[PDB]
From a paper:
Unbiased active site electron density shows vaborbactam covalently attached to the essential S294 in the catalytic domain; the boron bound to S294 is in sp3 configuration similar as observed when vaborbactam binds to serine β-lactamases. This hydroxyl moiety creates hydrogen bonding interactions with the backbone nitrogens of S294 and T487, with the hydroxyl of Y409, and with the backbone oxygen of T487. The amide oxygen of vaborbactam forms a hydrogen bond with the side chain nitrogen of N351; the amide nitrogen is hydrogen bonding with the backbone oxygen of T487. The carboxyl group of vaborbactam forms hydrogen bonds with T487, S485, and S349 and with water molecule W#1. The thiophene ring is seen forming hydrophobic interactions (< 4Å) with V333, Y503, and the T487 side chain. Although both the aromatic wall (residues Y503, Y532, and F533) and hydrophobic bridge (V333 and F533) are formed upon vaborbactam binding, the crystallographically refined temperature factors of these residues are considerably higher compared to the core of the catalytic domain. Based upon these observations, we posit that the more mobile aromatic wall and hydrophobic bridge residues in the vaborbactam and zidebactam complexes are due to the presence of fewer hydrophobic moieties in these low affinity PBP3 inhibitors that could drive such stabilizing conformational changes (both inhibitors lack an R2 group).
The PBP3 structure contains a non-catalytic N-terminal domain and the C-terminal catalytic domain. Ideas for such different scaffolds often arose from β-lactamase inhibitor development efforts as serine β-lactamases and PBPs are evolutionarily related and share the same catalytic serine, other active site residues, and mechanism. To test whether the β-lactamase inhibitor vaborbactam can extend its inhibition ability to a homologous PBP, we probed the binding of vaborbactam to P. aeruginosa PBP3.
Numbering used by the authors: 57 to 190, 213 to 490, 501 to 561
The structure:
């Protein structure tokens, strides 16, 4: 069988991400090798193998009319072995993958196994498109990924992990208009060109497989349900005093407890679990579940990355009050960073969900209106206030632009620090999620740990895409 040329993977602008490299596999007709034993030591040397074990191997398989000697030698090493002119030694031309961006886009692109077959990421997901048929060559695949945004994201997430002594992290950037993933980076990462002795830990595409309680980052969807109910406007007040609320044996507790009356923007700025719980009791869990289901939290992303986790959105016929509250302030559900980014992309795109893509989108599919454009517009303004208002997430602010977003912190006393947002706030182009796992320095809150990463990556990302500054006189 004639091994086919595996199709080129590029970024959205044709930068090479995975290239088929010529290599040499050497096989032997032992029957013919057994006629030239005096050549074996020179041949053993040229293969790196020991003289004795090489000789043991060939003697044992002297019946077989075929065995492999070595796979995936460089052509140069291959020519050296052919230059020995040993009877019973023949060469096949094979293809191994090289990844020029290396660790920068490891998780997204993935890699091939020993047989030039997709084992991780896009290599696995689009294996049939890229492989061709062993012989017709495989087809070029242009990713949605912008290598320029990917490098910035990679660099800033790495610097955030080190500055906070964190064990892991994820950053996803999405085009809100096209459903395209512009960047997807995880720490820790690995060099896919050197897979000799490296942990399955480093190879985990956390953005797509790590499921977590999103906490306060889904309070905006609870608020979308509130504004869509006809019962709530942004200027309405909730009494959250004294920052706790008993629901049978369950006690809802706010992290900050020096508030009485908050307006709905204030509930988001303070991330008040009591405030959102009381709104949830009024509107019913069904309306909150429905919005979260529709923006894709705990739902199949359709990206068909094998080992992709879907997480869980809990459902009930009759919602108990405790489950109603915990859903509303973002516990009792499990999501991935890609789902959260996708949910924020729909909010940012005036309530319209466009299907997620890891490949360059030339013809944008029709979106689903999952939140009414007026509710989406209102929730955008409130999330702009969360970043810009007194006591807000000022570290999320993006010089030259109106940014909008929401911090989160969950307990796993280890913590998960989250920031999800989009910019520019008036004409959203980009949604971003930053997840940092177990920050080990003093500040562990989303607004302290993850928000500065959002600021710098978003600042860079908007400039690389030549988005015009929207904070003018
Ligand atoms: B929410 O996930 O995040 C808020 C903080 C933020 O926005 O970064 C606080 C309320 C929510 N988190 C919790 O109630 C869980 C915590 C327990 C102790 C500290 S965070």
């Amino acid at each position: 069988a004639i091994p086919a040329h595996r199709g080129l993977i590029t970024d959205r602008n044709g930068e090479p991400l995975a290239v088929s490299t010529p290599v040499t596999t050497l096989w032997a007709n032992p029957k013919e090798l057994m006629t030239a034993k005096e050549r074996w030591p020179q041949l053993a040397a040229a293969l790196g193998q020991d003289t004795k074990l090489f000789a043991d191997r060939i003697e044992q398989n002297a019946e077989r009319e075929f065995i492999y000697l070595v796979r995936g030698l460089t052509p140069e090493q291959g020519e050296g072995v052919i230059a020995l002119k040993v009877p019973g030694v023949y060469s096949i031309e094979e293809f191994r993958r090289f990844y020029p961006a290396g660790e920068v886009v490891a998780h997204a692109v993935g890699f091939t196994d020993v047989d030039d077959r997709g084992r991780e990421g896009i290599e696995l997901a689009f294996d049939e498109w890229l492989a061709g048929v062993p012989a017709k060559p495989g087809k070029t695949l242009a990713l949605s990924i912008d290598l320029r945004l990917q490098y910035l994201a990679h660099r800033e997430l790495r610097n955030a992990l080190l500055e906070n002594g964190a064990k892991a992290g994820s950053l996803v950037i999405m085009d809100v208009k096209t459903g395209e993933i512009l960047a997807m980076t995880n720490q820790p990462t690995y060099n896919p060109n050197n897979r000799r002795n490296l942990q399955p830990a480093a190879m985990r595409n956390r953005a797509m497989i790590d499921v977590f309680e999103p906490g306060s980052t889904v309070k905006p969807f609870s608020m979308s349900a509130a504004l869509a109910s006809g019962r709530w406007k942004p200027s309405d007040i909730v009494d959250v005093y004294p920052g706790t609320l008993q629901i049978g044996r369950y006690t809802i507790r706010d992290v900050s407890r020096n508030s009485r009356q908050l307006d709905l923007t204030g509930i988001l700025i303070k991330s008040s679990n009591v405030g959102i719980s009381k709104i949830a009791f009024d509107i019913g869990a069904e309306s909150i579940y429905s919005v979260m289901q529709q923006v894709g939290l705990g739902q199949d992303t359709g990206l068909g990355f094998p080992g992709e986790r879907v997480g869980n959105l809990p459902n009930h016929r009759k919602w108990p009050k405790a489950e109603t509250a915990t859903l509303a302030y973002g516990y009792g559900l499990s999501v991935t960073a890609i789902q959260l980014a996708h949910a924020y992309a729909a909010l940012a795109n005036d309530g319209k969900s466009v299907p997620l893509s890891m490949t360059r989108v030339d013809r944008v599919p029709d979106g689903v209106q999952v939140i009414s454009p007026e509710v989406a517009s209102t929730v955008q303004g409130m999330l702009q206030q969360v970043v810009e208002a007194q006591g807000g997430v000022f570290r999320a602010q993006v010089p030259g632009y109106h940014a909008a977003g929401k911090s989160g912190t969950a307990r796993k006393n280890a913590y998960r620090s989250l920031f999800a947002g989009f910019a520019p706030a008036t004409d959203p182009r980009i949604a971003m999620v930053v997840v940092i796992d177990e920050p080990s320095k003093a500040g562990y809150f989303g607004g302290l740990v993850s928000a500065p990463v959002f600021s710098k990556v978003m600042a860079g990302a908007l400039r690389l895409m030549n988005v015009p500054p929207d904070n003018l006189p």
